[PDB]
Structures are given as structure tokens and as C-alpha cells.
Design a protein around this ligand. Structure first.
Ligand SMILES: *[C@@]1(O)C2=NCC(C)(C)CN2c2ccc(S(=O)(=O)N3CCC[C@H]3COc3ccccc3)cc21
Ligand SMILES: *[C@@]1(O)C2=NCC(C)(C)CN2c2ccc(S(=O)(=O)N3CCC[C@H]3COc3ccccc3)cc21
Lengths: 237, 238
């Protein structure tokens, strides 16, 4: 039909990978406020009736192993799958405590042909992480129904545009996760997911602007980036 | 508010760049069926009240100059902007008849800070082109609020295919993506929000198309388009 079947016995798993402290050997800074994000996400998705699992400070190999193991579970009774990544990043990559991991490597475990119990079901990846270091200064023969693509039914909700910084507040957490949780709490029971994320886009874009004693980091702006390979509308109610 | 203001005197420009024949120096083959796409789009957006401008076989230089020129027009009386790219490509790249153009280079002309008459208005880029050479084998079924906006805000990129992948085209019917896009626009433009129309495009391409080839390497392949939205509001064509 036009909407994903969301009345399975379980909504599904929500894995939250929260990397705050990084190996001294990498020289990466601590991510203050990420715990606020993790807590916020846990509550938001608990309310949406997901089975939330929080993990902290995982190495690159621990991330891969976790995803591999999770992709091997039986999701037959689950409507969907959600993974949230909170860490440093670059374009196409997220950081384990000890070094970079290609996002493709993580998401590949859930491909239509590699995780059969999630075939045809919405696979949501929410990524709070830099995608580079640019700063936004702002302005102002009938074969139907035989097969589906292995890349189909994924949604990648990026906190920021390709190549750009992603902003985070020590007190309130990241702009994106902050806004995402608020919009889900307010609209999960009346808007389709893409429309929810569009309001997150507007909230982040209009209501947030950096303030810094360092001119380089001051008055900066952010726009999130919705990437959908979904084939159906997604309602959480 | 919740929706873009789409009741300006004009809906806006729809630039269609249709690259079919390429310089021999590039070594790229003719794009059979692309003319079908270009005509389908012209008609589809004409019915949506867009001022359509078709361009054919432009060099990489001409594409840049065209985009620069268009971005320098006064879009004050126009609700939105649409650009359709039909060509060969690779990840992040679209081909002029005489070589590659970085997509960012093209879209940058329309950034919130560089095209003021489009600031706050939906800027739509529709890309029918390869994003790599991968094949999908498939599987059987304070208070600074509203002081400024991001410069990269209010763009939508409707890609024909997922990052890294081939995009499929039929010499008779045109590309899988453009076929489906025009069909869904024709049918749903007067009753669905744009993201929901594009989601039906996703489903149509994903379920109704599959390659047939005597060559095993190109046979039984599948495709999923890729919607990339930096939009801040819902978009309705009514
Ligand atoms: C981002 O996720 C990231 N990815 C990898 C790398 C190497 C670029 C490090 N990195 C990073 C560092 C810091 C942040 S942040 O959210 O703390 N934020 C983004 C812009 C810089 C920083 C805030 O800095 C200031 C400085 C002075 C006053 C206020 C804020 C995000 C990421
Ligand atoms: C794609 O846009 C593209 N980008 C650049 C480059 C150099 C890879 C050439 N290129 C390209 C060539 C052909 C197509 S297509 O739509 O004709 N299609 C996609 C997969 C190959 C081709 C169909 O191949 C066969 C072969 C045998 C039998 C049937 C079809 C797209 C692009």
C-alpha cells in the first residue's frame, strides 16, 4: 500500500551509539553534551515504543561487531529498525573511540539481501556527526513485485549538510538531536515521518545560531539533510 | 509557516539540460532515449505552470555560464526554481558534452547568499545520471530566531539513484526515474506534498523496473532513487 506496516508485535530496536571519550592516541576531543542527547533519544524512542539499547565509547571494531551481531538477530516480529550514531565524523564516516569507520560498512549489514528479517521494512539511521569542517555563515515485459533493490527502504537522517560542521551544546546537547526529539514528541501522532523531519529542518535552520568569543565560530548556522530511499510513508501511530 | 508560499505571480523557471551527444574526447556513448525524458518533463512542468527552458548538448563551460546567468536573474516574482539535469555522471559529478562538472559548482550559484531573489524559496535539482558504476542485484520479495537562515537551506536534490550506483535508461521509454517522476507528478501534483510524490516515485522505480540482458553482468538489476532534502517547509504545487 502507501504506508509501511507498523502494526507488528514490536516497533523494533533503537540502537544508540554514544561516543563521548576518545583514545588519547587519536587526539580527538571529548564530546560534551552528548549524554544529554543520548538520554533525550532514549526517552523519545521509549515513548514511541521502541526497544532502546544504549552503548557508550565503542572502538571502530566494536561498532562493526555490534552492528554485525544486531543484523543477525531475528527481526521478524519487528516493524522497523533504528540506529543512532553520536560521535565525531567526516563525510561518509563516523568515528569509533580509536579511529574512523565508513558509514557504508555499518549500514551494509542491513541491506535488503543481508538482513532478510528487515527486508521491506524501514531502516532508519540517525547521524549526529560532522560531515566535514565547513561552516555555514547564513544569510539575512512486466517484472513488477518480483524483486526490490538491496538499497531500498533506508532513511538516513543526517544532522547536517554534506561537508559541513554539526553543532552541539554542552548544556542542551546537539542542535539536531534536540530539535529531532522535540518534533517527534510533538508530532509523532499526527505527521508522516518526512514531514516531521522537515519541521526539524526548519527548527534547526531558524531557531539556532552559534554564539562564540571566537569570531570564527560565531553567528554560524546549520541545516540538516534528509536522505530517503524509503518506498512508503512512515507513521509512528 | 508550514508550507512554502507558492502563490507568487509565477511558479518559476524550469531549466532542462538535455545532454545526448558527447565529444569523442570524452569517450562516452550517446544517451539513447533522453529526448523522450526531456519532452516528458517539458510537458509535465508546463502543466505545473513553470516557464520551461530546454537546452541541448551543452559543454561543461556552457552549463556553468547558463547556471550563473540564470542565478543572476530577478526571481522576485517567482515562487520557486527547478533545474533538471539529464546526462552521464559519477558521484558528485555531472557531464557536459566535453567533460565533468562538479554538481556543487552548479548548485552554489543558487545559495541563499548568492541568489537573493530565491532566498527562502524552494530550489529543486532533479538529477538523472550515474553516481558510480555499482549495480543493485536486488532481493526477491537568547533569541536569534529567524535572524538568518543557512545558505544551504531550501535545496532539494532528487537523485535518480543511490550514491555510488548506475542509473538506468530505456532507449524507447526514457530513464526509469524520469518516466516515474513525470507519471507521479501528472497523477499526484494536485493532491500530494512533494516529498510524498517523490516517495511514490521511489516505490514505482523500485518495484516496476528490472533490467533484462543477454549479458549476465547487466541482467536482472534493480534501482532505488535517492531523495535529499534541505527543505524547511512542505511543498505543494496547487
Ligand atoms: C564534529 O562532530 C567533528 N567531526 C570530526 C572533527 C575532527 C572535525 C571534530 N569534530 C567536531 C568538533 C567539535 C564539534 S562541536 O559541536 O563542539 N562544535 C562545532 C563547531 C566547533 C564546536 C564548537 O566550538 C565552539 C568554540 C567556541 C565557542 C563555542 C563553540 C563538532 C564536531
Ligand atoms: C551513466 O549515466 C554513466 N555515467 C558515466 C559512465 C562513463 C559510467 C557512462 N554512463 C552510463 C552509460 C549507460 C547508462 S544506461 O542507462 O544506458 N545503462 C546503465 C547500465 C549500463 C546501461 C545499460 O546497459 C545494458 C547492457 C546490455 C543490455 C542492456 C542494457 C547510464 C550511464
Amino acid at each position: 500500500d502507501n504506508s509501511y506496516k507498523m502494526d507488528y508485535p514490536e516497533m523494533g530496536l533503537c540502537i544508540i551509539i554514544n561516543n563521548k571519550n576518545f583514545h588519547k592516541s587519536t587526539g580527538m576531543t571529548s564530546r560534551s553534551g552528548t549524554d544529554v542527547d543520548a538520554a533525550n533519544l532514549r526517552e523519545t524512542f521509549r515513548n514511541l515504543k521502541y526497544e532502546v539499547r544504549n552503548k557508550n565509547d565503542l572502538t571502530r571494531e566494536e561498532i562493526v561487531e555490534l552492528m554485525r551481531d544486531v543484523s543477525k538477530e531475528d527481526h521478524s516480529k519487528r516493524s522497523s529498525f533504528v540506529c543512532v550514531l553520536l560521535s565525531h565524523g567526516e563525510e561518509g564516516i563516523i568515528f569509533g573511540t580509536n579511529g574512523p569507520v565508513d558509514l557504508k560498512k555499518i549500514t551494509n549489514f542491513f541491506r535488503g539481501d543481508r538482513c532478510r528479517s528487515l527486508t521491506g521494512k524501514p531502516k532508519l539511521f540517525i547521524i549526529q556527526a560532522c560531515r566535514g569542517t565547513e561552516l555555514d555563515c547564513g544569510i539575512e515485459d512486466d517484472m513488477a513485485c518480483h524483486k526490490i533493490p538491496v538499497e531500498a527502504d533506508f532513511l538516513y537522517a543526517y544532522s547536517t549538510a554534506p561537508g559541513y560542521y554539526s553543532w552541539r551544546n554542552s548544556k542542551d546537547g546537539s542542535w539536531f538531536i534536540q530539535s529531532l526529539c522535540a518534533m517527534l514528541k510533538q508530532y509523532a501522532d499526527k505527521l508522516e515521518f518526512m514531514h516531521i523531519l522537515t519541521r526539524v529542518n526548519r527548527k534547526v535552520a531558524t531557531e539556532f545560531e552559534s554564539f562564540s568569543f571566537d569570531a570564527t565560530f560565531h553567528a554560524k548556522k546549520q541545516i540538516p539533510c534528509i536522505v530517503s530511499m524509503l518506498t512508503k510513508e512512515l507513521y509512528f501511530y
